[PDB]
Amino acid sequence: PIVQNIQGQMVHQAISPRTLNAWVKVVEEKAFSPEVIPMFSALSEGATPQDLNTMLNTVGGHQAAMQMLKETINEEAAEWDRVHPVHAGPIAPGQMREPRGSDIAGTTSTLQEQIGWMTNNPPIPVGEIYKRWIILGLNKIVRMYSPTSILDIRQGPKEPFRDYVDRFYKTLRAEQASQEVKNWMTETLLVQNANPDCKTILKALGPAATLEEMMTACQG
Amino acid sequence: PIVQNIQGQMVHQAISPRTLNAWVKVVEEKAFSPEVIPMFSALSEGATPQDLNTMLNTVGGHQAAMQMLKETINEEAAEWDRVHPVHAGPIAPGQMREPRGSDIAGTTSTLQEQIGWMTNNPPIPVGEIYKRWIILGLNKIVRMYSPTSILDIRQGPKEPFRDYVDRFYKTLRAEQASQEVKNWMTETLLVQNANPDCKTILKALGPAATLEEMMTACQG
Amino acid sequence: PIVQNIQGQMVHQAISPRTLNAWVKVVEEKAFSPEVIPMFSALSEGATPQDLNTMLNTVGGHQAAMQMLKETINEEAAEWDRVHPVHAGPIAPGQMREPRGSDIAGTTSTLQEQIGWMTNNPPIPVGEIYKRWIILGLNKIVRMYSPTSILDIRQGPKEPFRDYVDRFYKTLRAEQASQEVKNWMTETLLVQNANPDCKTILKALGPAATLEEMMTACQG
Amino acid sequence: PTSILDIRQGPKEPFRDYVDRFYKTLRAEQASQEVKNWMTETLLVQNANPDCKTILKALGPAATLEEMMTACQG
Amino acid sequence: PIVQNIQGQMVHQAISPRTLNAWVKVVEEKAFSPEVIPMFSALSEGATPQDLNTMLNTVGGHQAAMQMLKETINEEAAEWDRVHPVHAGPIAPGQMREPRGSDIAGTTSTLQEQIGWMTNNPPIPVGEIYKRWIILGLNKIVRMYSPTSILDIRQGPKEPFRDYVDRFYKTLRAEQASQEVKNWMTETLLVQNANPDCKTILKALGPAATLEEMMTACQG
Amino acid sequence: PIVQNIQGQMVHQAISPRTLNAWVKVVEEKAFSPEVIPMFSALSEGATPQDLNTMLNTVGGHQAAMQMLKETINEEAAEWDRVHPVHAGPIAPGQMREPRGSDIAGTTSTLQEQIGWMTNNPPIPVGEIYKRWIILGLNKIVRMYS
């Protein structure tokens, strides 16, 4: 990443072997659970596109997911290049040229150009855009790994409300719907799909139902 | 209503008996269907709040719905009076005073104040606000009147696809959710709740499912 | 709908209730049949897009057909926007700007703008365009409500020739694939599917036979 | 261990393991990316199970990987 | 086809019957081989679109292939119109005709118009454009007529290397791909699918060996 | 070929269908005998490289021999390009540029450049070199066929 030296210039630093080992371990250990995206955004902070490409290439297996992520990055780069014209010709000294989509993807650039684009005034968040693209791809991947749909969750006769709402919120986190539609879903289907006993319990509870009072009512 | 004379002043005209007869006939024969709101908005065009109060009072029976509508009108009037200060004191001639919420409802005024407010320059439309409040109330009523919810619609084994989509779209018209949630449900739960045979047919149809294509696929 | 006056000019007029009542009655009583399009074209002559949206929203029941019509109107509006692009630069003093594909439907424009568009100099026929779109949608609807195809017609041994030709021409007018193909069908498929006795009676007159002699042959 | 031309799906071997093994062998293999673009569209659908073969061919030749996957999902 | 006539003035010479007989015979005897494309390109040198239409109509059988050819000609004309629309510009001092997709395809263009477009200065390459279209169509047809895929070409246990490489190169020429794909395939697929007895011989020679070395190695 | 008009310019003329028909007939009926090379050199006289490519592509079957012939043409073109430098930059009008090996093969040019090279002063015969290469290839083929 790019660690900022204390009261000094920000110095470039190679990705830590500890960071890369933790990343490959969490990938191998947890496959593609919805928390791998937060943990990836945590491990990779202020990292160059070279660092992000390394963190992606060290992943072993799940080559279909990797190819889908690369296709998503390619689509994002194509859209960027389409909606952003690229200038050419002689360029004034002390000012880097227009970053192309293939360069912001890191497939046709070098660490020097990446650091230059990340140190310019004003700075150009090449890392923050490539990380956004990688997060979109990882979101597509985790949506593809979703075993069951959200509309098809039904509580078992013996399966308790805690386990039911755990599965429901896991599938909701995996879901792809927008946040505005995501709210209505957890407002309605949560009480509409439960077992009849606690369903009538929450119906007697009525409106303004919150998770805490719901779980305290469905006790026993 | 307020008929606009051809090349002349917009002369006031009392509501014809035909309008009230058609209104009482539809509210008697058709109960409270989703379409009544469009027919109500059609019959009453450019009508003073006195005309709308006459059209509402002539309704016979279903007094619970009328009380709910009056409560909704009262809530809207309270909100209007809260978020709009009312001026007092001596008022300059040729300029009507500030319309109050209980006054914009027409319960504390005569026809002259309404006609003056609908003829001022610039015009202050009391009819288009009182009709909006009545439409909100009628929407609450028709939502309350719906017998079954939208999430609990399931196609019968012998019941064809046409009847199923008819019931589904009727309940959707009766639904209270926002338009984006409406699009989400009419996109997903339509094919997610059909009979397994045509369910697999529409799954083979794939994305971009359009209603005419669906109904042409499920034929036979 | 606009109406001409004694001086010759036209101005908006409120939609008559026993037009809405007649349209709703003919839609429900006759459901969907080829003779609903002429009635619709006759009922709403000169109607503004708001009046057509009224006459469409007022149709309770058969919501699938109304959604088909809405989708057809939707696609038609998009084509109009694509075919003509608004010009840039200074606008002439005697001319002002035009409506969009979605505003032809009247979904996002007030009634006064429709009246100004219809009575401009030169007049802009938004009402006629939206009526053409609605007529195309109704043609597709009556196509869907066809109970058989044109090829499956085969007269029964006892079904009279009159009923056979009635059913044939009914599903032929409900086909509307083309006009010259219709002319070829009425020559070939009409003579190809007769009962053997009356079949050879029609063959006795050759292909030059007209429909009148065609029926009075099998008559009596 | 094996060439990319030898990758073939078993009769009941799910599409998941087949595409995983195929892409793993393709990544281990050495060739220009331009050749791989034709290699995938020529080999992925052909070596699949007959039922899944017809299922993917119903989607189209230029179908993406995610649609081809969700076709035979489960 | 037009031909340079003494002296220096091109005049129209109708297509000779012997050329049409040669074309019919080559299509009868050789069906749709890869070599027909060169024979067609050489039999119709500098032919007016009418001559190419005659040569495509005189074919006997293979009506499906002729239909694909006609449809691809239509597609090329459609794309040509899209790629060559009349954008507003100052009118040229000198006017020369212009060939439309339908004027190039010889459908609605009289012979005199084509003679004009060809002999005028500067010439309009209508003949070469229509020949390129027909050649693309013939490439499509000959790539469709391939009995087996190039990937399925495998040598028999005692099938000599002679017939094996002959059939392999024939199917490869019928196959469609870029030249670099063929360069990779001739190095990756040819030696692998050979018979093991001679496969060991080809492996002993080397990976980058030429065709003649392997052919004289497994010779006999 | 390039027919020389009687008291006139050497007008270009497309290969007649009879030449190609006789060529495909002999290559089909007689396989690859030693005499075919003389008959090939006889049928194609003063022909542009486009004519020779058309005469070679029309051959049906024996694709191994055609691939060997194309490999021999490629080797000869590589040798020609190695032992002859190719000039570039702006070229004076009325004087064609330096013919490249891949260009002398006719695979990277049109008929106009060949006709210009076969009409320049002094003439630069592309046909007599491309035919020489095709004859070397056919000699290798007939040696292999023995």
XYZ file of N, CA and C in Angstrom, chain C residues 5-202:
594
model
N -66.798 26.151 -32.019
C -67.801 27.107 -31.589
C -68.438 27.786 -32.799
N -69.298 28.770 -32.521
C -69.962 29.503 -33.593
C -68.956 30.297 -34.416
N -67.971 30.918 -33.758
C -66.958 31.675 -34.481
C -65.964 30.773 -35.204
N -65.917 29.486 -34.867
C -65.059 28.539 -35.541
C -63.896 28.025 -34.719
N -63.545 28.692 -33.625
C -62.422 28.248 -32.813
C -62.853 27.137 -31.857
N -61.861 26.428 -31.330
C -62.086 25.313 -30.424
C -61.390 25.568 -29.095
N -61.931 24.974 -28.037
C -61.414 25.118 -26.680
C -61.746 23.832 -25.930
N -60.994 23.560 -24.868
C -61.199 22.344 -24.092
C -62.618 22.277 -23.539
N -63.119 21.054 -23.406
C -64.426 20.784 -22.832
C -64.316 19.557 -21.941
N -64.979 19.606 -20.785
C -64.937 18.488 -19.858
C -65.539 17.242 -20.497
N -64.936 16.089 -20.201
C -65.404 14.835 -20.776
C -66.782 14.497 -20.225
N -67.682 14.094 -21.107
C -69.052 13.822 -20.697
C -69.115 12.506 -19.928
N -69.829 12.454 -18.803
C -69.978 11.172 -18.092
C -70.668 10.108 -18.921
N -71.520 10.506 -19.867
C -73.049 8.845 -20.128
C -71.180 8.764 -21.576
N -70.153 9.445 -22.085
C -69.137 8.771 -22.887
C -68.396 7.728 -22.064
N -67.973 8.104 -20.851
C -67.273 7.162 -19.986
C -68.162 5.976 -19.631
N -69.430 6.237 -19.308
C -70.339 5.146 -18.964
C -70.537 4.203 -20.140
N -70.744 4.753 -21.339
C -70.932 3.912 -22.515
C -69.687 3.088 -22.813
N -68.504 3.689 -22.673
C -67.267 2.959 -22.925
C -67.069 1.830 -21.920
N -67.272 2.110 -20.630
C -67.127 1.065 -19.625
C -68.145 -0.046 -19.849
N -69.377 0.307 -20.224
C -70.387 -0.720 -20.454
C -70.047 -1.577 -21.667
N -69.600 -0.954 -22.763
C -69.288 -1.729 -23.957
C -68.038 -2.567 -23.740
N -67.111 -2.063 -22.923
C -65.874 -2.858 -22.664
C -66.234 -4.111 -21.859
N -67.020 -3.953 -20.788
C -67.417 -5.092 -19.918
C -68.412 -6.034 -20.604
N -69.504 -5.487 -21.147
C -70.581 -6.315 -21.756
C -70.066 -7.102 -22.967
N -69.306 -6.454 -23.853
C -68.798 -7.138 -25.071
C -67.380 -7.672 -24.840
N -66.804 -7.411 -23.660
C -65.425 -7.861 -23.344
C -64.501 -7.366 -24.461
N -63.695 -8.258 -25.044
C -62.828 -7.841 -26.175
C -63.257 -8.589 -27.447
N -63.674 -7.825 -28.462
C -64.118 -8.360 -29.776
C -63.680 -7.378 -30.867
N -63.517 -7.791 -32.144
C -63.055 -6.862 -33.185
C -63.865 -5.581 -33.272
N -65.101 -5.574 -32.771
C -65.965 -4.396 -32.851
C -65.866 -3.506 -31.621
N -64.724 -3.508 -30.933
C -64.506 -2.587 -29.821
C -63.605 -1.458 -30.299
N -62.802 -1.729 -31.330
C -61.928 -0.695 -31.880
C -62.714 0.388 -32.613
N -63.691 0.071 -33.475
C -64.494 1.157 -34.065
C -65.260 1.954 -33.023
N -65.826 1.281 -32.019
C -66.524 1.991 -30.958
C -65.582 2.913 -30.191
N -64.362 2.455 -29.904
C -63.407 3.314 -29.217
C -63.015 4.507 -30.084
N -62.775 4.275 -31.376
C -62.403 5.374 -32.260
C -63.538 6.374 -32.427
N -64.786 5.923 -32.292
C -65.918 6.829 -32.447
C -66.222 7.576 -31.151
N -65.966 6.942 -30.003
C -66.314 7.562 -28.731
C -65.406 8.740 -28.393
N -64.124 8.652 -28.730
C -63.120 9.606 -28.279
C -62.535 10.407 -29.435
N -63.390 10.871 -30.341
C -62.924 11.719 -31.432
C -62.538 13.096 -30.905
N -61.274 13.460 -31.105
C -60.774 14.729 -30.618
C -60.427 14.760 -29.149
N -60.319 13.608 -28.501
C -60.031 13.570 -27.074
C -58.552 13.829 -26.815
N -58.274 14.567 -25.745
C -56.910 14.852 -25.337
C -56.261 13.601 -24.750
N -54.923 13.562 -24.693
C -54.261 12.411 -24.063
C -54.717 12.145 -22.638
N -55.089 13.186 -21.889
C -55.656 12.961 -20.563
C -56.968 12.194 -20.648
N -57.810 12.516 -21.632
C -59.073 11.804 -21.789
C -58.852 10.347 -22.175
N -57.840 10.071 -22.999
C -57.556 8.685 -23.355
C -56.976 7.912 -22.177
N -56.097 8.543 -21.392
C -55.625 7.898 -20.172
C -56.768 7.647 -19.198
N -57.762 8.539 -19.175
C -58.963 8.302 -18.382
C -59.719 7.079 -18.884
N -60.022 7.047 -20.184
C -60.776 5.941 -20.759
C -60.050 4.611 -20.637
N -58.723 4.631 -20.511
C -57.975 3.393 -20.319
C -57.891 2.986 -18.854
N -57.633 3.932 -17.951
C -57.544 3.599 -16.535
C -58.903 3.200 -15.966
N -59.988 3.687 -16.570
C -61.332 3.423 -16.070
C -61.789 1.992 -16.337
N -61.074 1.246 -17.174
C -61.468 -0.116 -17.515
C -61.088 -1.050 -16.373
N -62.054 -1.361 -15.513
C -61.800 -2.334 -14.466
C -61.862 -3.747 -15.012
N -60.984 -4.603 -14.502
C -60.882 -5.959 -14.994
C -60.100 -6.044 -16.292
N -59.728 -7.272 -16.647
C -58.883 -7.535 -17.809
C -57.596 -6.723 -17.731
N -56.963 -6.763 -16.556
C -55.800 -5.918 -16.317
C -54.602 -6.369 -17.143
N -54.566 -7.644 -17.541
C -53.487 -8.117 -18.395
C -53.537 -7.443 -19.760
N -54.735 -7.302 -20.328
C -54.868 -6.615 -21.608
C -54.475 -5.148 -21.490
N -54.869 -4.498 -20.395
C -54.482 -3.103 -20.203
C -52.977 -2.969 -20.023
N -52.331 -3.952 -19.398
C -50.877 -3.903 -19.275
C -50.202 -4.130 -20.622
N -50.763 -5.015 -21.450
C -50.267 -5.159 -22.815
C -50.364 -3.842 -23.570
N -51.500 -3.156 -23.443
C -51.664 -1.868 -24.112
C -50.673 -0.843 -23.586
N -50.427 -0.843 -22.274
C -49.453 0.081 -21.703
C -48.052 -0.206 -22.233
N -47.690 -1.486 -22.340
C -46.375 -1.845 -22.869
C -46.239 -1.437 -24.331
N -47.292 -1.655 -25.122
C -47.261 -1.242 -26.521
C -47.124 0.268 -26.653
N -47.857 1.025 -25.832
C -47.736 2.478 -25.845
C -46.323 2.892 -25.450
N -45.761 2.176 -24.469
C -44.393 2.462 -23.958
C -43.376 2.337 -25.098
N -43.383 1.202 -25.803
C -42.432 0.941 -26.916
C -42.640 1.968 -28.035
N -43.899 2.289 -28.347
C -44.221 3.258 -29.432
C -43.639 4.633 -29.088
N -43.751 5.048 -27.820
C -43.235 6.367 -27.379
C -41.713 6.420 -27.564
N -41.021 5.326 -27.228
C -39.545 5.258 -27.348
C -39.129 5.411 -28.816
N -39.865 4.767 -29.729
C -39.550 4.823 -31.182
C -39.664 6.267 -31.683
N -40.692 6.994 -31.234
C -40.904 8.400 -31.672
C -39.715 9.266 -31.234
N -39.231 9.069 -30.004
C -38.073 9.857 -29.502
C -36.834 9.544 -30.348
N -36.615 8.263 -30.662
C -35.435 7.831 -31.460
C -35.490 8.367 -32.899
N -36.661 8.305 -33.545
C -36.788 8.716 -34.979
C -36.508 10.213 -35.190
N -36.976 11.090 -34.297
C -36.738 12.546 -34.499
C -35.955 13.148 -33.328
N -34.772 13.758 -33.566
C -33.975 14.374 -32.507
C -34.179 15.897 -32.511
N -34.400 16.491 -31.334
C -34.602 17.929 -31.248
C -33.411 18.685 -31.823
N -33.703 19.740 -32.577
C -32.662 20.559 -33.176
C -32.083 21.531 -32.152
N -30.835 21.923 -32.376
C -30.142 22.870 -31.521
C -30.036 24.231 -32.203
N -29.541 25.209 -31.447
C -29.367 26.546 -31.954
C -30.529 27.456 -31.616
N -30.524 28.666 -32.168
C -31.611 29.609 -31.882
C -32.915 29.162 -32.528
N -34.017 29.435 -31.839
C -35.339 29.070 -32.323
C -35.991 30.293 -32.957
N -36.790 30.054 -33.993
C -37.453 31.142 -34.698
C -38.402 31.884 -33.756
N -38.632 33.181 -33.980
C -39.526 33.929 -33.078
C -40.971 33.467 -33.132
N -41.467 33.087 -34.307
C -42.837 32.641 -34.444
C -43.093 31.199 -34.079
N -42.069 30.471 -33.641
C -42.191 29.067 -33.278
C -41.562 28.833 -31.911
N -42.133 27.834 -31.226
C -41.747 27.331 -29.899
C -41.560 25.791 -29.915
N -40.876 25.253 -28.902
C -40.543 23.813 -28.770
C -41.641 22.725 -28.615
N -41.362 21.561 -29.211
C -42.219 20.352 -29.230
C -42.181 19.347 -28.048
N -43.231 18.424 -28.024
C -43.224 17.433 -26.922
C -42.320 16.194 -27.129
N -42.139 15.376 -26.084
C -41.287 14.200 -26.148
C -42.134 12.944 -26.315
N -41.451 11.808 -26.473
C -42.159 10.545 -26.624
C -43.081 10.234 -25.467
N -42.628 10.481 -24.234
C -43.463 10.209 -23.070
C -44.565 11.241 -22.890
N -44.347 12.483 -23.321
C -45.358 13.521 -23.195
C -46.461 13.412 -24.239
N -46.220 12.701 -25.343
C -47.304 12.394 -26.271
C -48.383 11.588 -25.567
N -47.983 10.688 -24.668
C -48.955 9.917 -23.904
C -49.703 10.790 -22.905
N -49.151 11.950 -22.559
C -49.745 12.792 -21.548
C -49.453 12.376 -20.127
N -48.412 11.570 -19.912
C -48.111 11.083 -18.569
C -47.458 12.157 -17.706
N -46.672 13.046 -18.305
C -45.930 14.057 -17.560
C -46.156 15.440 -18.153
N -47.412 15.778 -18.437
C -47.750 17.101 -18.944
C -49.170 17.446 -18.515
N -49.397 18.725 -18.239
C -50.710 19.171 -17.795
C -51.661 19.320 -18.979
N -52.946 19.484 -18.660
C -53.972 19.569 -19.696
C -53.817 20.821 -20.552
N -53.407 21.937 -19.946
C -53.263 23.176 -20.698
C -52.209 23.036 -21.791
N -51.130 22.298 -21.515
C -50.127 22.061 -22.545
C -50.680 21.214 -23.681
N -51.516 20.219 -23.369
C -52.158 19.440 -24.423
C -53.049 20.321 -25.287
N -53.816 21.212 -24.655
C -54.704 22.091 -25.412
C -53.897 23.047 -26.283
N -52.787 23.560 -25.753
C -51.938 24.428 -26.552
C -51.294 23.699 -27.713
N -50.934 22.431 -27.507
C -50.366 21.631 -28.588
C -51.398 21.336 -29.666
N -52.649 21.108 -29.270
C -53.691 20.736 -30.220
C -54.255 21.928 -30.978
N -54.236 23.122 -30.377
C -54.760 24.328 -31.013
C -53.657 25.312 -31.381
N -52.430 24.833 -31.569
C -51.332 25.695 -31.973
C -51.447 26.040 -33.456
N -50.553 26.913 -33.916
C -50.487 27.273 -35.326
C -49.087 27.003 -35.847
N -48.860 25.923 -36.609
C -49.873 24.936 -37.002
C -50.192 23.941 -35.888
N -51.392 23.364 -35.912
C -51.779 22.425 -34.853
C -50.921 21.167 -34.875
N -50.688 20.611 -33.695
C -49.924 19.381 -33.517
C -50.892 18.294 -33.061
N -51.071 17.220 -33.829
C -52.073 16.195 -33.485
C -51.529 15.139 -32.524
N -51.357 15.526 -31.259
C -50.937 14.568 -30.242
C -52.058 13.578 -29.950
N -53.303 14.060 -29.956
C -54.428 13.179 -29.695
C -54.558 12.086 -30.736
N -54.394 12.435 -32.012
C -54.479 11.435 -33.072
C -53.335 10.433 -33.011
N -52.122 10.873 -32.663
C -50.999 9.952 -32.531
C -51.242 8.966 -31.396
N -51.666 9.471 -30.236
C -51.912 8.577 -29.112
C -53.104 7.669 -29.379
N -54.091 8.149 -30.145
C -55.202 7.292 -30.543
C -54.744 6.189 -31.485
N -53.838 6.495 -32.414
C -53.285 5.455 -33.278
C -52.542 4.410 -32.460
N -51.750 4.860 -31.484
C -51.041 3.915 -30.624
C -52.012 3.033 -29.848
N -53.073 3.630 -29.299
C -54.047 2.855 -28.539
C -54.785 1.878 -29.447
N -55.059 2.277 -30.690
C -55.729 1.381 -31.621
C -54.827 0.204 -31.970
N -53.524 0.448 -32.126
C -52.599 -0.657 -32.361
C -52.552 -1.596 -31.156
N -52.522 -1.031 -29.952
C -52.551 -1.857 -28.757
C -53.819 -2.688 -28.655
N -54.961 -2.093 -28.999
C -56.222 -2.829 -28.969
C -56.256 -3.908 -30.044
N -55.623 -3.659 -31.189
C -55.497 -4.705 -32.200
C -54.698 -5.880 -31.664
N -53.581 -5.603 -30.988
C -52.812 -6.695 -30.392
C -53.608 -7.413 -29.306
N -54.414 -6.678 -28.542
C -55.222 -7.296 -27.494
C -56.263 -8.232 -28.101
N -56.984 -7.767 -29.125
C -57.998 -8.609 -29.753
C -57.342 -9.754 -30.510
N -56.076 -9.594 -30.901
C -55.324 -10.723 -31.441
C -55.083 -11.772 -30.367
N -54.684 -11.339 -29.168
C -54.454 -12.292 -28.087
C -55.739 -12.991 -27.666
N -56.848 -12.259 -27.593
C -58.122 -12.842 -27.183
C -58.759 -13.719 -28.252
N -58.068 -13.994 -29.351
C -58.585 -14.913 -30.353
C -58.605 -16.323 -29.779
N -59.763 -16.983 -29.711
C -59.808 -18.298 -29.050
C -59.054 -19.383 -29.802
N -58.420 -19.256 -31.944
C -57.778 -20.298 -32.732
C -57.015 -19.666 -33.884
N -56.124 -20.451 -34.482
C -55.369 -20.007 -35.640
C -56.201 -20.155 -36.908
N -55.681 -19.595 -38.004
C -56.423 -19.605 -39.260
C -56.335 -20.969 -39.939
N -55.255 -21.712 -39.693
C -55.053 -22.973 -40.404
C -55.879 -24.106 -39.808
N -56.185 -24.042 -38.512
C -56.861 -25.149 -37.845
C -58.337 -25.252 -38.213
N -58.843 -24.359 -39.064
C -60.263 -24.368 -39.388
C -60.584 -25.555 -40.282
N -61.486 -26.415 -39.808
C -61.993 -27.530 -40.603
C -63.457 -27.726 -40.254
N -64.327 -27.576 -41.248
C -65.762 -27.671 -41.004
C -66.156 -29.102 -40.661
N -67.004 -29.240 -39.646
C -67.501 -30.530 -39.240
C -68.497 -31.090 -40.234
N -68.765 -32.397 -40.146
C -69.724 -33.007 -41.077
C -71.130 -32.446 -40.960
N -71.514 -31.954 -39.784
C -72.853 -31.424 -39.570
C -72.885 -29.909 -39.430
N -71.777 -29.278 -39.055
C -71.737 -27.830 -38.902
C -72.059 -27.157 -40.231
N -73.104 -26.329 -40.301
C -73.499 -25.749 -41.587
C -72.414 -24.854 -42.163
N -72.468 -24.675 -43.486
C -71.484 -23.840 -44.166
C -71.540 -22.401 -43.672
N -72.723 -21.935 -43.266
C -72.853 -20.571 -42.770
C -72.042 -20.372 -41.497
N -72.173 -21.291 -40.539
C -71.393 -21.193 -39.309
C -69.903 -21.342 -39.580
N -69.528 -22.219 -40.513
C -68.119 -22.384 -40.855
C -67.530 -21.094 -41.404
N -68.208 -20.475 -42.374
C -67.673 -19.255 -42.967
C -67.722 -18.103 -41.971
N -68.711 -18.094 -41.069
C -68.743 -17.080 -40.023
C -67.536 -17.198 -39.104
N -67.256 -18.406 -38.615
C -66.086 -18.611 -37.765
C -64.799 -18.264 -38.504
N -64.695 -18.681 -39.769
C -63.528 -18.400 -40.592
C -63.274 -16.906 -40.691
N -64.283 -16.144 -41.122
C -64.080 -14.711 -41.283
C -63.912 -14.002 -39.952
N -64.489 -14.531 -38.868
C -64.254 -13.949 -37.552
C -62.783 -14.050 -37.169
N -62.228 -15.266 -37.195
C -60.821 -15.416 -36.839
C -59.894 -14.847 -37.902
N -60.403 -14.573 -39.106
C -59.596 -13.919 -40.128
C -59.491 -12.421 -39.875
N -60.611 -11.775 -39.541
C -60.557 -10.380 -39.126
C -59.796 -10.224 -37.818
N -59.815 -11.252 -36.969
C -59.022 -11.227 -35.746
C -57.558 -11.571 -35.985
N -57.202 -12.028 -37.188
C -55.813 -12.352 -37.490
C -55.022 -11.099 -37.850
N -55.440 -10.403 -38.912
C -54.841 -9.136 -39.329
C -53.338 -9.258 -39.565
N -52.904 -10.408 -40.091
C -51.505 -10.545 -40.476
C -51.154 -9.620 -41.631
N -52.029 -9.535 -42.634
C -51.850 -8.623 -43.758
C -53.159 -8.496 -44.523
N -53.128 -7.833 -45.676
C -54.318 -7.657 -46.496
C -54.301 -8.494 -47.763
N -53.151 -8.600 -48.431
C -53.062 -9.448 -49.617
C -52.974 -10.919 -49.231
N -52.295 -11.219 -48.119
C -52.305 -12.581 -47.600
C -53.721 -12.988 -47.214
N -54.510 -12.046 -46.695
C -55.921 -12.312 -46.452
C -56.648 -12.627 -47.752
N -56.315 -11.902 -48.824
C -56.945 -12.151 -50.116
C -56.578 -13.522 -50.666
N -55.358 -13.990 -50.409
C -54.980 -15.330 -50.846
C -55.641 -16.396 -49.980
N -55.753 -16.133 -48.677
C -56.382 -17.087 -47.774
C -57.853 -17.281 -48.115
N -58.575 -16.192 -48.385
C -60.000 -16.327 -48.676
C -60.240 -17.071 -49.985
N -59.226 -17.153 -50.854
C -59.356 -17.988 -52.042
C -59.022 -19.447 -51.748
N -57.931 -19.703 -51.025
C -57.454 -21.075 -50.856
C -58.061 -21.783 -49.644
N -57.869 -21.240 -48.443
C -58.333 -21.936 -47.243
C -59.853 -22.019 -47.167
N -60.570 -21.079 -47.785
C -62.027 -21.133 -47.763
C -62.542 -22.307 -48.584
N -61.915 -22.566 -49.734
C -62.364 -23.662 -50.583
C -61.751 -24.996 -50.168
N -60.668 -24.974 -49.385
C -59.943 -26.214 -49.118
C -60.538 -27.007 -47.957
N -61.391 -26.386 -47.138
C -61.865 -27.013 -45.909
C -63.376 -27.221 -45.868
N -63.999 -27.555 -46.994
C -65.438 -27.768 -47.006
C -65.776 -29.249 -46.829
N -67.036 -29.512 -46.498
C -67.509 -30.882 -46.374
C -67.642 -31.520 -47.757
N -67.269 -32.801 -47.885
C -67.048 -33.386 -49.224
C -68.164 -33.146 -50.227
N -69.427 -33.341 -49.833
C -70.538 -33.108 -50.749
C -70.579 -31.649 -51.192
N -70.774 -30.729 -50.245
C -70.741 -29.321 -50.609
C -69.371 -28.905 -51.122
N -68.304 -29.610 -50.727
C -66.985 -29.321 -51.282
C -66.984 -29.484 -52.796
N -67.462 -30.628 -53.293
C -67.470 -30.822 -54.736
C -68.545 -29.971 -55.410
N -69.610 -29.600 -54.688
C -70.545 -28.629 -55.262
C -69.859 -27.290 -55.498
N -68.992 -26.869 -54.573
C -68.230 -25.641 -54.804
C -67.187 -25.825 -55.899
